[PDB]
Design a protein around this ligand. Sequence first.
Ligand SMILES: NC(=O)c1ccc[n+]([C@@H]2O[C@H](COP(=O)([O-])OP(=O)(O)OC[C@H]3O[C@@H](n4cnc5c(N)ncnc54)[C@H](OP(=O)(O)O)[C@@H]3O)[C@@H](O)[C@H]2O)c1
Lengths: 412, 416
Amino acid sequence: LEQMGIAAKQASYKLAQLSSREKNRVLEKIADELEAQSEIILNANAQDVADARANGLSEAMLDRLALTPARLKGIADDVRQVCNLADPVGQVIDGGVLDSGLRLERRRVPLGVIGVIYEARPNVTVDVASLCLKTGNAVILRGGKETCRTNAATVAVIQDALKSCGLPAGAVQAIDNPDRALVSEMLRMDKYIDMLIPRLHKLCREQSTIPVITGGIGVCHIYVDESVEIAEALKVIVNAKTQRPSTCNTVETLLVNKNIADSFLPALSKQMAESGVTLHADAAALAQLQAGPAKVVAVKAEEYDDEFLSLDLNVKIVSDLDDAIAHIREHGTQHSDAILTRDMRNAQRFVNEVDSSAVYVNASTRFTDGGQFGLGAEVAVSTQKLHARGPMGLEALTTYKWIGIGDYTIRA
Amino acid sequence: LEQMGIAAKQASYKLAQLSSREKNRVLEKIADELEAQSEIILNANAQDVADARANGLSEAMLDRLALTPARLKGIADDVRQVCNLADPVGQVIDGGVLDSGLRLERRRVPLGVIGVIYEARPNVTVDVASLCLKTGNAVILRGGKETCRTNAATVAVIQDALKSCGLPAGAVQAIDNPDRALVSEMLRMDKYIDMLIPRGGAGLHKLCREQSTIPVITGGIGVCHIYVDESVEIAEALKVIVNAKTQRPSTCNTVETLLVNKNIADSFLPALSKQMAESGVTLHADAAALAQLQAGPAKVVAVKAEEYDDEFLSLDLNVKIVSDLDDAIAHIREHGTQHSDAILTRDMRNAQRFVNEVDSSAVYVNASTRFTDGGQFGLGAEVAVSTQKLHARGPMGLEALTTYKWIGIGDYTIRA
Ligand SMILES: NC(=O)c1ccc[n+]([C@@H]2O[C@H](COP(=O)([O-])OP(=O)(O)OC[C@H]3O[C@@H](n4cnc5c(N)ncnc54)[C@H](OP(=O)(O)O)[C@@H]3O)[C@@H](O)[C@H]2O)c1
């Protein structure tokens, strides 16, 4: 795989000097060619879907790994959308004249070669390819074993487009082979790859030597204060849970203040049965919600630290804001945390004392997305504290360097 | 070390919840105490320098270890200047209003617990402690073998100041034992320290990166190349080179390879040989420049292959003749450590191309490579020079020790 890495390095060197207009024309060209050769992609997708169905995968997984012609049309659409974004490469961050007559400035530059790992997601292939092409970063894709044929066809089409536009063919590469030893090798190219996006986390945590920007699992907690409007809080909770539960930013643990719980829990159950989410409630929550129409069961200790990714929820009663903060600190994964309240001091304390990647006040937790934050598109959501945090846009894939201009200046 | 880490975390929470006035008070008291207790620090440093010289320490190494009253006043002034800096905690990076009506913004926050493993140097401890206190982080320091008594005195003074100010005693901690097993255990303890800063040579960096479970901002070694173009002033280039090399050769931002164009090599090489002979710099010249530098007064010797990829840390320089700007760029890319690179030229196009095509942490045009320092770059003080690409790069100031957090405010806003 050394040859592939050296090809990616050369491609990054060539791409770092490109112009914004050339990148936009390239993006439009690849979108056009993807639209043109839709039938070839669809045939491979149908074959892969038939193979997966023969393997016994569920209907939901089969739909997820499938691709309709409408889906590829949408892929062309968001590629064209990223074509219209603002290029952050070369932009000046800050600068000034020093005391010794030296003019300093900081300039944004491409991060180099980016290796991303995913599984059973066909659209993310084209999405990450376009996003790295816009920034001028050579990308190495880890296509899933399930959809190897579709990913191979897509990367072949993109490479054909790049050759048509004259760009080096090594800008975008993919490893179709599903061998785990190759995965370890990719996890152990420090000198070549400069940054890794794992979209599984434990494996790279143990083995990786390249700096890793993790995505991580997300258990988002919502705290309900004693003074709040019942109907609006219920609507916010329903939007946070009912709409697309499979997303990693959905709420999982709901914290209800002790004082308001007596009134909140009955209406919560009344709306909850209509929404139809199972309530893994605590002991006191069980006692209060037993009369409720919504189905409710006891909660186990390990359920608080794991995301259901389904129509399930956890109900816990806390004494006050300090108890909720302690619980969030102990069990939270630092992904998203929101508070519904009508007190200014409580909101200020919650904002100051919580160290999540995104804190909301009287808002849903479903806004932790690249599109909602106005970043155009995102590659992943980072829960670490280094480099980018939260949704990662274009500027998250660029580093900076210092440039100093003088006239034979010497330090004194 | 588990109790050390838990104390660090407990102190870090309160430090992140503190205000700017208290941190400024702590820093001012630290500076005043350091000025008051100069005699003990000076005596300890003198004893340590004498002991190290008794073990045949290098002159540059001794100079790095040596601390004068002027240097103590300088570190006190640096502490005060850091105290005068604006607090980067709570500052807003950007914000706006979304379509859905969600007022969004980004705010700076402390990183948490910071571990640092530095070389044998007395001032780096004070600067690291001051920066971590100003930023609201808790710091665990592991010093070198030589700086034992000076580091003990400095950490005692800092802890006394923290106790006097009423801040939690776990904010700043240091490990006295020079055993490397403790270093390995610090490396393996992840859930407690949030970021590790190693300062040293290749061996330490390799050791941590082999057994690291924490994010690491490598200090890295410095091989700084200076490229001389065809059209350039000989005297000014010689002065810049002399300033880059002669002044403090023990640093990590000192030029180690001199790239000379063929066209200018006819005239630049002789005069250079005269200049370095004044400074006693030994010239490790390539085969092409060996004939030209043979008649020069300065001592000249052939250069081995591995010399291009290692730091001399002495009064030595590598002289190589390159064909053009592209050859120099290729050589810098192949053998450079991405620390600092400078070009001396009188052509605009060459300077622009060199700035564009060189992906180093610092690029200079008609300037020395000795400017790659936290103080010179306008920052109050530096914790380390980062040669990596993730998070901070180049000198690391106050903003390099902070992360950010998104905050959104709305009136029960719902995503559609
Ligand atoms: N990048 C920067 O910002 C920066 C700044 C200053 C200096 N430097 C670099 O500093 C280097 C010279 O430093 P130095 O003279 O102190 O020598 P060094 O060998 O680079 O120092 C290594 C440091 O780590 C410790 N160490 C060494 N081997 C270790 C091991 N196997 N496991 C754990 N710890 C280990 C050393 O103390 P023990 O030997 O007692 O373990 C010392 O504190 C230069 O190459 C220069 O580039 C870089």
